[PDB]
Design an enzyme around this catalytic site. Structure first.
Site, PDB file in Angstrom:
ATOM      1  N   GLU A  46       0.782  -1.247   0.000  1.00 35.88           N
ATOM      2  CA  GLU A  46       0.000   0.000   0.000  1.00 35.88           C
ATOM      3  C   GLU A  46       0.822   1.310   0.000  1.00 35.88           C
ATOM      4  OE1 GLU A  46      -3.465  -0.024   2.770  1.00 35.88           O
ATOM      5  OE2 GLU A  46      -3.809  -2.097   2.112  1.00 35.88           O
ATOM      6  N   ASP A  70      -7.243  11.244  -0.432  1.00 36.46           N
ATOM      7  CA  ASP A  70      -7.371  10.022  -1.230  1.00 36.46           C
ATOM      8  C   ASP A  70      -8.209  10.292  -2.495  1.00 36.46           C
ATOM      9  OD1 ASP A  70     -10.161   9.713  -0.254  1.00 36.46           O
ATOM     10  OD2 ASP A  70      -9.387   8.608   1.487  1.00 36.46           O
TER      11      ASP A  70
END
Ligand SMILES: CCCC[C@](C)(O)C/C=C/[C@H]1[C@H](O)CC(=O)[C@@H]1CCCCCCC(=O)O
Ligand SMILES: CCCCCCCC/C=C\CCCCCCCC(=O)OC[C@H](O)CO
Ligand SMILES: CCCCCCCC/C=C\CCCCCCCC(=O)O
Ligand SMILES: CCCCCCCC/C=C\CCCCCCCC(=O)O
Ligand SMILES: CCCCCCCC/C=C\CCCCCCCC(=O)O
Length: 444
Positions: free
Chosen positions: A215, A224
């Site tokens: 990740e 995000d």
């Protein structure tokens, strides 16, 4: 010096260099062509190329040195034209710099793999490392071809058993260029090796590093895809669009006033919290709970990795795979996980996860075992060996540029002999000593 001038030095040097480098190549070929799971084939590719570079450099230089000793010296008699001397000078310089730059390429690669593990796993392709070793060679060969064109020259050195870089403007520039190119190689090696060791000490838990590769780690507040405030390993701070609300959320979770910036230790603390919560979800799920209990700590990390990617419900949908995990049918479970939309979307991540479930090892992500101290000692050894072998030549050359009667001729032979020893020790330092003395490591 009657002692320093002896045929016993090139004979024993060629012998030791030949055995070591020919065997290093043989072991690399047996360990690379296997076609397993880890893409660390590039580390084998560099060692294999280093052994070849070292072996050819010894095969092209030493027989000439032996022949001149047998003929009772006088290099100029055996070579009245300048062909063998310029060639010898070229082969000494091209194979000399290549060894130092390959040693530096490895140092840089190891440092990138540990300091930026997320970027390393996605950006590599292996074709780039093969191109770099080809590019480094051609760049070094081109530099070595300068006396052929006119810049600098290769002259016969004392005691008339070898040729090297001569020490008005052209000769001094070419010598200085080699001196600074060699010291840059050592500085790049020492810096990357010190950075690597420092980072191995800083390493977090095996779960933490596993999800860092998959990740990524960000120590600064970022938005995000949906526009939500996030930090560390995908930790959502707040669903509110306010930056102030996010900074106060991070300050409550940590304690101190962070103001958007945190440390790896603080990110690991937020990660450990997310691990606790994901375990709560697994235990509360009727299907995931019996699977979690039946699995070991290493295999549980592979399940937590999936939960982080898809969620509790997403993982639960793999009914056939979960049943095989409790039944311990590792090989069959791997096939069913591969037959998924998830595998096609993220092929590199799914492959690392499936391998962790199948083998029950961290092998897909890295070593992290007892190899972490083994690598630290190996990197420390490189720095010691490289500096004692290559510093005298490089310092002697800079002193010669700065301008029996002189004993500099005797020490220059000692200096080049030490630099030649580095390419004899290379197969032992990088591969052979670990492969042979792997048993006393467990004993000590
Ligand atoms: C300047 C760095 C060159 C190092 C190298 C690329 O690795 C090639 C060295 C090869 C050595 C080999 O390791 C044994 C040998 O003979 C070669 C030449 C040694 C220097 C000349 C000394 C002459 C003498 O002994 O009188
Ligand atoms: C006359 C000259 C005699 C040659 C001198 C020394 C040879 C021994 C050199 C040993 C090199 C150090 C290797 C080491 O101990 O490190 C562990 C290894 O790198 C883990 O892979
Ligand atoms: C167990 C690791 C194996 C290491 C093998 C060591 C190889 C040594 C071979 C030849 C000695 C080289 C001589 C260099 C010293 C220069 C000093 C001098 O010229 O008198
Ligand atoms: C005569 C030749 C002189 C020998 C020169 C160098 C030998 C290299 C010694 C390597 C010791 C490794 C030290 C360590 O990293 O723990
Ligand atoms: C960096 C470390 C460099 C250390 C020493 C360089 C070698 C010293 C060269 C001087 C030898 C000349 C002489 O024989 O008197």
């Amino acid at each position: 010096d009657c002692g320093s001038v002896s045929v016993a030095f090139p004979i024993t040097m060629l012998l030791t260099g030949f055995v070591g480098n020919a065997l290093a190549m043989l072991l690399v070929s047996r360990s690379y062509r296997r076609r397993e799971s880890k893409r660390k084939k590039s580390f084998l590719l560099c060692i294999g190329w280093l052994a070849l570079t070292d072996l050819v450099g010894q095969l092209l230089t030493t027989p000439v040195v032996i022949v001149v000793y047998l003929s009772k010296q006088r290099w100029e008699h055996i070579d009245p034209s300048g062909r063998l001397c310029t060639f010898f000078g070229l082969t000494m310089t091209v194979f000399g710099l290549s060894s130092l730059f390959i040693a530096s390429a490895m140092a840089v690669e190891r440092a990138l793999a540990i300091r930026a593990p997320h970027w390393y796993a996605s950006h590599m392709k292996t074709r780039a490392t093969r191109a770099v070793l080809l590019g480094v060679w051609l760049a070094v060969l081109a530099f070595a071809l300068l006396p052929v064109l006119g810049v600098g020259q290769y002259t016969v050195q004392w005691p008339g058993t070898w040729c090297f870089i001569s020490t008005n403007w052209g000769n001094l520039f070419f010598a200085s260029a080699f001196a600074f190119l060699g010291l840059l190689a050592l500085t790049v090696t020492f810096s990357c090796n010190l950075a690597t060791i420092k980072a191995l000490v800083s390493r977090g838990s095996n779960i933490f590093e596993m999800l860092r590769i998959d990740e990524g780690l960000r120590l600064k507040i970022y938005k995000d895809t949906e526009g939500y405030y996030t930090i560390g390993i995908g930790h959502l701070l707040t669903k509110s669009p306010s930056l102030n609300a996010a900074k106060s959320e991070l300050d409550k979770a940590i304690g101190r006033n962070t103001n958007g910036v945190i440390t790896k230790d603080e990110a690991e603390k937020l990660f450990n919290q997310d691990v606790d919560a994901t375990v709560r979800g697994i235990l509360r799920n009727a299907k995931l709970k019996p699977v979690y209990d039946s699995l070991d700590a290493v295999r549980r990390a592979a399940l937590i990795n999936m939960v982080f990617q898809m969620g509790e419900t997403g993982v639960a949908g793999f009914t056939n795979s979960l049943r095989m995990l409790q039944q311990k049918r590792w090989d069959e479970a791997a096939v069913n996980l591969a037959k998924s939309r998830w595998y096609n979307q993220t092929p590199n991540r799914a492959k690392r996860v499936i391998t962790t479930f199948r083998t029950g090892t961290w092998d897909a992500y890295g070593s992290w075992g007892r190899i972490t101290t083994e690598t630290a000692i190996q990197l420390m050894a490189i720095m010691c060996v490289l500096s004692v072998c290559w510093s005298p030549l490089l310092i002697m050359m800079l002193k010669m540029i700065f301008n029996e009667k002189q004993k500099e001729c005797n020490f220059f032979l000692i200096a080049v002999r030490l630099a030649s020893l580095n390419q004899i020790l290379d197969p032992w330092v990088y591969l052979l000593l670990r492969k042979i003395l792997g048993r006393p490591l467990e004993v000590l």
